[PDB]
Amino acid sequence: LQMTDGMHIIVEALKQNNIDTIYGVVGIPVTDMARHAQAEGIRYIGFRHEQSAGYAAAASGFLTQKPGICLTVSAPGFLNGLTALANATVNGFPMIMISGSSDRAIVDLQQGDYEELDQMNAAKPYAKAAFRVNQPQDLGIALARAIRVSVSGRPGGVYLDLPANVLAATMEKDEALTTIVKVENPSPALLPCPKSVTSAISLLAKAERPLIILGKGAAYSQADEQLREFIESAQIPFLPMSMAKGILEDTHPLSAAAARSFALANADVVMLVGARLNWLLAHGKKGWAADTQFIQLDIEPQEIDSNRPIAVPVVGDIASSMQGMLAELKQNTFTTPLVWRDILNIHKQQNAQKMHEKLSTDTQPLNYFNALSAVRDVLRENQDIYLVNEGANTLDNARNIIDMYKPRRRLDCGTWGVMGIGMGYAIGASVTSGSPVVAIEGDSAFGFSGMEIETICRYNLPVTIVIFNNGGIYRGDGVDLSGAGAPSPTDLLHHARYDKLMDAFRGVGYNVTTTDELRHALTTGIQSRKPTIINVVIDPAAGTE
Amino acid sequence: LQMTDGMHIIVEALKQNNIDTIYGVVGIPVTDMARHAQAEGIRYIGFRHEQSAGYAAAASGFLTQKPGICLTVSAPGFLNGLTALANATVNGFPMIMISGSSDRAIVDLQQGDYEELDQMNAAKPYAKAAFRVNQPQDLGIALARAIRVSVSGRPGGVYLDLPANVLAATMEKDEALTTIVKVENPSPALLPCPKSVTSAISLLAKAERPLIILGKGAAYSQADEQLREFIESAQIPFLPMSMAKGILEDTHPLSAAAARSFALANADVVMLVGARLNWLLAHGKKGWAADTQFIQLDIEPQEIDSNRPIAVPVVGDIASSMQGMLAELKQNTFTTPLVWRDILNIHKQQNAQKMHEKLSTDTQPLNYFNALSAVRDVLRENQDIYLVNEGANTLDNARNIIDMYKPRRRLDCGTWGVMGIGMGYAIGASVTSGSPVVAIEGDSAFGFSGMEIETICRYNLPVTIVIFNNGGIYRGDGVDLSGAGAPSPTDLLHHARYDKLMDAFRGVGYNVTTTDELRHALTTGIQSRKPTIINVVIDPAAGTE
Amino acid sequence: LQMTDGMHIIVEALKQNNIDTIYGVVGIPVTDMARHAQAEGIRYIGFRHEQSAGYAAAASGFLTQKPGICLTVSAPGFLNGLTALANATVNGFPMIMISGSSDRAIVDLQQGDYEELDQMNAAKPYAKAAFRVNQPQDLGIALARAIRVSVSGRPGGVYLDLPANVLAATMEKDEALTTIVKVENPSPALLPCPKSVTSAISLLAKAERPLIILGKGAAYSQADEQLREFIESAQIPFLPMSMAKGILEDTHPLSAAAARSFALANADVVMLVGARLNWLLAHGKKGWAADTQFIQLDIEPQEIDSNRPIAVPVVGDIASSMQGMLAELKQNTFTTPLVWRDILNIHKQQNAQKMHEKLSTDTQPLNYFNALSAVRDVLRENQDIYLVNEGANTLDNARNIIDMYKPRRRLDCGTWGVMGIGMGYAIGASVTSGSPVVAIEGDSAFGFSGMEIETICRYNLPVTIVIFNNGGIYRGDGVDLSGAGAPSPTDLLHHARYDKLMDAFRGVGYNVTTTDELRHALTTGIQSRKPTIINVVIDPAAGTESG
Numbered sequence A, B: 001l002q003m004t005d006g007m008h009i010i011v012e013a014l015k016q017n018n019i020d021t022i023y024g025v026v027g028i029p030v031t032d033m034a035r036h037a038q039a040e041g042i043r044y045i046g047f048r049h050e051q052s053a054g055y056a057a058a059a060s061g062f063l064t065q066k067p068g069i070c071l072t073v074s075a076p077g078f079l080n081g082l083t084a085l086a087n088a089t090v091n092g093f094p095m096i097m098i099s100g101s102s103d104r105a106i107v108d109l110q111q112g113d114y115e116e117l118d119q120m121n122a123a124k125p126y127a128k129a130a131f132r133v134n135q136p137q138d139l140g141i142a143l144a145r146a147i148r149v150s151v152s153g154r155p156g157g158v159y160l161d162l163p164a165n166v167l168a169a170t171m172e173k174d175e176a177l178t179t180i181v182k183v184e185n186p187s188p189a190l191l192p193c194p195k196s197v198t199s200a201i202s203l204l205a206k207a208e209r210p211l212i213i214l215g216k217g218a219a220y221s222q223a224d225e226q227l228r229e230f231i232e233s234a235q236i237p238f239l240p241m242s243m244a245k246g247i248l249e250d251t252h253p254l255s256a257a258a259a260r261s262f263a264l265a266n267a268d269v270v271m272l273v274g275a276r277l278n279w280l281l282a283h284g285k286k287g288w289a290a291d292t293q294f295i296q297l298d299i300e301p302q303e304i305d306s307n308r309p310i311a312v313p314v315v316g317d318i319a320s321s322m323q324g325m326l327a328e329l330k331q332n333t334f335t336t337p338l339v340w341r342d343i344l345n346i347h348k349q350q351n352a353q354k355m356h357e358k359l360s361t362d363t364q365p366l367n368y369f370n371a372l373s374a375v376r377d378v379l380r381e382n383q384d385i386y387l388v389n390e391g392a393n394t395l396d397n398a399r400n401i402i403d404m405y406k407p408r409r410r411l412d413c414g415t416w417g418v419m420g421i422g423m424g425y426a427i428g429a430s431v432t433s434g435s436p437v438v439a440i441e442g443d444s445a446f447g448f449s450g451m452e453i454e455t456i457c458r459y460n461l462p463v464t465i466v467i468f469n470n471g472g473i474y475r476g477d478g479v480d481l482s483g484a485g486a487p488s489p490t491d492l493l494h495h496a497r498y499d500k501l502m503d504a505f506r507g508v509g510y511n512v513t514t515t516d517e518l519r520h521a522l523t524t525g526i527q528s529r530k531p532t533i534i535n536v537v538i539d540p541a542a543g544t545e
Numbered sequence C: 001l002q003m004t005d006g007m008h009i010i011v012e013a014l015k016q017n018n019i020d021t022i023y024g025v026v027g028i029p030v031t032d033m034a035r036h037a038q039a040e041g042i043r044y045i046g047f048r049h050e051q052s053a054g055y056a057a058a059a060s061g062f063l064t065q066k067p068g069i070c071l072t073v074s075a076p077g078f079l080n081g082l083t084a085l086a087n088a089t090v091n092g093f094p095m096i097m098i099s100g101s102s103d104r105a106i107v108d109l110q111q112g113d114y115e116e117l118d119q120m121n122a123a124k125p126y127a128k129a130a131f132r133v134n135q136p137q138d139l140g141i142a143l144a145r146a147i148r149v150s151v152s153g154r155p156g157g158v159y160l161d162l163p164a165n166v167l168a169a170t171m172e173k174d175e176a177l178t179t180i181v182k183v184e185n186p187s188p189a190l191l192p193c194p195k196s197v198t199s200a201i202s203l204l205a206k207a208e209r210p211l212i213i214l215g216k217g218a219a220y221s222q223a224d225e226q227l228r229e230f231i232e233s234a235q236i237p238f239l240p241m242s243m244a245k246g247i248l249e250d251t252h253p254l255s256a257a258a259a260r261s262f263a264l265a266n267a268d269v270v271m272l273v274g275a276r277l278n279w280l281l282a283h284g285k286k287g288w289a290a291d292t293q294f295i296q297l298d299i300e301p302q303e304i305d306s307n308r309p310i311a312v313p314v315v316g317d318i319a320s321s322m323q324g325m326l327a328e329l330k331q332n333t334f335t336t337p338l339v340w341r342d343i344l345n346i347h348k349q350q351n352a353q354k355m356h357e358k359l360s361t362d363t364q365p366l367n368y369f370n371a372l373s374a375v376r377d378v379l380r381e382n383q384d385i386y387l388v389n390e391g392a393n394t395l396d397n398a399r400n401i402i403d404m405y406k407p408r409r410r411l412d413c414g415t416w417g418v419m420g421i422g423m424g425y426a427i428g429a430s431v432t433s434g435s436p437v438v439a440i441e442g443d444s445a446f447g448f449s450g451m452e453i454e455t456i457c458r459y460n461l462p463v464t465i466v467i468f469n470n471g472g473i474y475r476g477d478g479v480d481l482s483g484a485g486a487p488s489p490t491d492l493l494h495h496a497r498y499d500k501l502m503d504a505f506r507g508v509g510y511n512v513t514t515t516d517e518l519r520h521a522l523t524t525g526i527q528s529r530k531p532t533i534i535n536v537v538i539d540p541a542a543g544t545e546s547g
């Protein structure tokens, strides 16, 4: 009798389901598991804080449609991981957080166990599902569920709880192998009702001023060719939400991004593609026509009529829907009014002109617009990068200024406006892709995951971090209104040199005060493939609050 | 009619309740509140991550018996703060986390608000209470409750939710002033049943081998003189739990710490003073006599019989209890058997001898024992510091080796074994005391709150950070068992120089490889009162897992 | 080697802790547990629905200060009992609900087990603590905690989860006996700050118009003699809340009940004794002087400053605080001003006279006032009874009109205004005391637990149920506003005869349309000690609608 244990079973389950990376922080009881997973050919990436590890996991699920794996220990590590699990769920990114937990009997009586918490029920409100495995023969089915749940419907976080004892529990090795489940097709296609598809084309054909909105669901769907084809056939102006930038290149002629306010105020029929009417679209109220009619393509029927009533729900998975939308268009082709495209273009150009003047006008110190014009100069010549971006002014201005050329290349604060996602998204993106990453970081944003620069160095990841050091949150020029001369609630240290942090870890730092310095430092950064911080001196007074 | 708003009301409530510091991270909707609080003479301390701010708040409540105040924004900031609120509750440290929340009507319908979450119900499982204020006329009563709840019973975290709209809501300034509540005596004395006090002395008088255990509740109580007096009158050997070190100096003759295992294995009557029989005392099972009888002084009746049956519960607040224990002793004095004190001392000395040999034996590279012998050399000559300590080996060895001379001077990982508490406890301790802090940090532990070094610099706090750089979690010598040469799950960067991090922020760094270097670097550190990192090179193989 | 199992251990643990009654409803996996508990001398009371079993447990807790035991099966049984656990925690009544649950491994993975629900987490929001026991050797200590938690602080419900596997799990009998825990003094006395006590007496001694308020915390504490001596010594007028009626008799010359709103509107110093400034006291807001100063005796510091700022908190158990208050009074005596007592008495008199016209005036049909005057005349002669009461007009009028003479004899809708406590309360009160119970029930109220009349007949309990049948919720005279002639939302069947329900179970029914018939039926009911229903024909227009 050859015998095995839960730890070995779970690692084998992960292997057969083609998990090739784990993002984590170890400690009791999970160290041996991570060692063995690595032993078994799984890439283990160890972080300085579990939050970043969970952010890396979610980033990777967003890029692949395969759930990223976050590994943590019991209560204090689990809780740090839980904050990233929550954010994955909110954003619709698939991931599974696997955490050690303590002794079920002790925790159930609340006697004060090591790292005691009911982790399973603690995760429930933040996860699509929360599963706990008490028997090693159930590990494989439990992972099967975790995988399916994480990628079906609107994708999200799943919590898988592994009590210390299930990892130690033994079974016959042969029988164990029969309990392992390899999931085929974890999220099947769900096709819309044909009649809703035909109503959708019909209402679009009757539209005087149609607009398509592409959200993260559109991006996640990988239906890039189908979307382009639909948009181009009917010449329908579209707006990309932040992380849908690049499905079609941002400089595409049908992009209404440069006159977004005007487009939303005037469109008479709006077609949401995996985009919620949440605060990011002002709930379809402020800045919109009183009378807009909506078509909505969403995988999740519970999202329909969440905010404004939806004339044409088109419920099913987005690729499937666009397949059928395409076929129905071919049977009943139309072209969007030229006058609409034309009035759009009029606004687009006035706005690009005003932008251009801000972008080409040099200043000392640098502001957000000339600084980002410099970044854009370099990124135009380096189109195969991933862009991670977080902050306030640093976020809004980079979103508007940096164009994306390819789909699923932008990672940012997201639906909850989280400061802290940059390092982890940077690591998840580069581990997943093997490509360089540029992280354009506000200086407050940066400090929420800063220590992860050590991890970037430890794994020799090609990430260049560009910090917009304006000396604080929004602006660097706050004053202590007491007359006591203390830093104001929004000030960070006057003239901090973030590029130096890298000295500690044998990585590259540049300090940049001008666009020419910035251009050089950022080009070298990317082309070197070395971990790098670029500290960018930004006028403390360039930001708005 | 002079009019005021919720923001102004809440700041005034905080002022009248003698809140003089707020630890926080701002953003929407709380920036204006922090600015005004600072305007009104409240010291605002702004962090890089809310977790550290909440740790600072809890540290300050532990030292003062006054709840520390943690201020955050809505969902993503609230969630980061929640992880420190949870830890305060677990440890029995008073604090109030005040967070902005969004629009109640939008969140209640789950329509996708800005930073949407039911923060109130999210905090419930981690807090003594969670309150939400919808009317500005209720702000003062709500803060009154927050304060009382946080400090009564076993102290803990309280969540106070302030929707964006209550901060904007206006009322007549004069009437507003009548709605503000100044709490007098937030936690009244609770005196034990006289009969339980007399049973307690009685069972102690009959004891052959009595032992007292002092927990964090004993420490928090500030009953230092009463405890010393009781222990010395009856000559009762005591053990200090980690953060009760220093109530009586650690070198006190009645301290059984150097033969802790023996003391617990043999004591026949154990008197718990604000110490739980949780995992930290192995639940009163493994390493204890089959037949130990317990006396327990605890403020919380729900803690009695949690683990082992308790012969003599003494329920009431600890100062009150020790008052009555003292009076009853005087009426019925006894002395602990000399033979017990003597056998204890026999073990104590054998153990101090073995320790001494590890401590005085020089090595290259340094190990935990000679390194800490060096720290202890410096701390003997600098007794007015606060000691923050976290890690694994760094934690266990510093606990055993560094003596405390005064009460409530040690801050560490605590009941949940949290890596990440060091910077925040360091900042909370120095802001609260005005004294220097020495943080003895494992290198994994450090990276959970590292970025807070900027904050230490921004406020020019006298904190010296001593990092035990063994190159990883527990040990620095892990190997990738795949044969791929990747860092093992436990390795951090080979030879990272954490002292350099300080360059970024205009603070002091030392690298130390020997005890003489360490001694010099640490003395200068403290006496300079400058923010400092000491990177200490530790044999990667000195630790145990 | 003699073996035992979890089921045997928990029963022994109950026995050693002096549990002598369990209220429940059996089924998988607890039927054998109940059988064996009964075999071991524990009295088993089985119900038609678990919520009444849970209501009976919490009544038994309030009466005795020993947690009542409610037993249920898994998910659907559990959830019914949980509604009653909720009510106990809200009212401050100690009880423990012990529920069987299913297989931990299956429920943890949400595979659709038999009766699947994480019952422990389900109970958490409604209970002082929720515990779950996985190992048989942990059963005794789990019960010890449940007991201590249920009775310490402000008492409340505790949930104790017994997975089917733990009940069947075996261990050696001798080793098993060593893991049983007998709790001595589960709620220790907690003594107030003596400074609080001296400040309280001094504020009372400065008051021009002091008022004591007795809450159900005062009734639960069992400090009847200390509260009475304190009140009578300084001659402080007192208001009893509903379930505090009778600590001192309601006819006591110092009761301000007959002038409640005057008393609250005009007192300058008010001493709350286990009484919360919650909605039953209008939060200390509406109907109170603008600057009332409060002294508050409560065991729970969390309750202080909940609503109004409290001038003098006196935190500790009510018996110990009253012991300190009396000793401080004896050192520093004072007598409430005669003028305040005399002016209260003038208002009590105006109100008492208004109430007397209503009570004494005959009507056909009967109304609440003359019907209850007849009930009061009967109850004055039977001061050993327990009074259960619920409904709306039926509750408020009985509460004002039926005087209590002894403490802890009145049981009602309580803090959450629950309809459906009536039969549970009647059963727990009679089983607990051995005494007759009279339940004065609104007809809508009764229907929430009416099938428990079979339980009452099964155990031959001395319960007389008097239903004020006005044909509806508040009133029986509603009309369908659409014109279709359907019953209105507040109507119940016109002229239902609830007295006839008892023929199913060999109980006694009376139907009564007059005060003389009511008086006779109710007297015969009480004396008979037989399960009885009295259907009282009340005017459908007599009631007012709350809101």
Ligand SMILES: Cc1ncc(C[n+]2csc(CCOP(=O)(O)OP(=O)(O)O)c2C)c(N)n1
Binding pocket: A390, A391, A392, A393, A394, A395, A416, A417, A418, A419, A420, A441, A442, A443, A444, A445, A446, A448, A468, A470, A472, A473, A474, A475, A543, B025, B026, B027, B028, B073, B076, B077, B080
């Ligand atoms: C975890 C978290 N904490 C706090 C906030 C509130 N918040 C919004 S923006 C921001 C930082 C803004 O400054 P910065 O990143 O430096 O960019 P800048 O505006 O200065 O370019 C913060 C802390 C948040 N969104 N997330």
Ligand SMILES: Cc1ncc(C[n+]2csc(CCOP(=O)(O)OP(=O)(O)O)c2C)c(N)n1
Binding pocket: A025, A026, A027, A028, A073, A076, A077, A080, B390, B391, B392, B393, B394, B395, B416, B417, B418, B419, B420, B441, B442, B443, B444, B445, B446, B448, B468, B470, B472, B473, B474, B475, B543
């Ligand atoms: C937030 C959190 N994450 C993970 C753990 C698990 N854990 C225990 S010790 C430890 C770090 C141990 O190494 P280190 O701090 O460097 O001290 P050393 O043993 O090397 O001296 C970790 C991550 C924890 N307790 N808390």
Ligand SMILES: Cc1ncc(C[n+]2csc(CCOP(=O)(O)OP(=O)(O)O)c2C)c(N)n1
Binding pocket: C390, C391, C392, C393, C394, C395, C417, C418, C419, C420, C441, C442, C443, C444, C445, C446, C448, C468, C470, C472, C473, C474, C475, C543
């Ligand atoms: C469990 C529950 N359901 C509903 C209510 C709402 N409610 C208040 S009083 C009442 C019944 C009133 O009628 P009745 O009991 O017949 O008294 P009457 O006023 O007619 O004498 C109800 C159902 C409640 N309080 N509890």
Ligand SMILES: [Mg+2]
Binding pocket: A442, A443, A444, A445, A468, A469, A470, A471, A472, A473, A474, A475
């Ligand atoms: Mg900034």
Ligand SMILES: [Mg+2]
Binding pocket: B442, B443, B444, B445, B468, B469, B470, B471, B472, B473, B474, B475
């Ligand atoms: Mg280390």
Ligand SMILES: [Mg+2]
Binding pocket: C391, C442, C443, C444, C468, C469, C470, C471, C472, C473, C474, C475
């Ligand atoms: Mg009725």
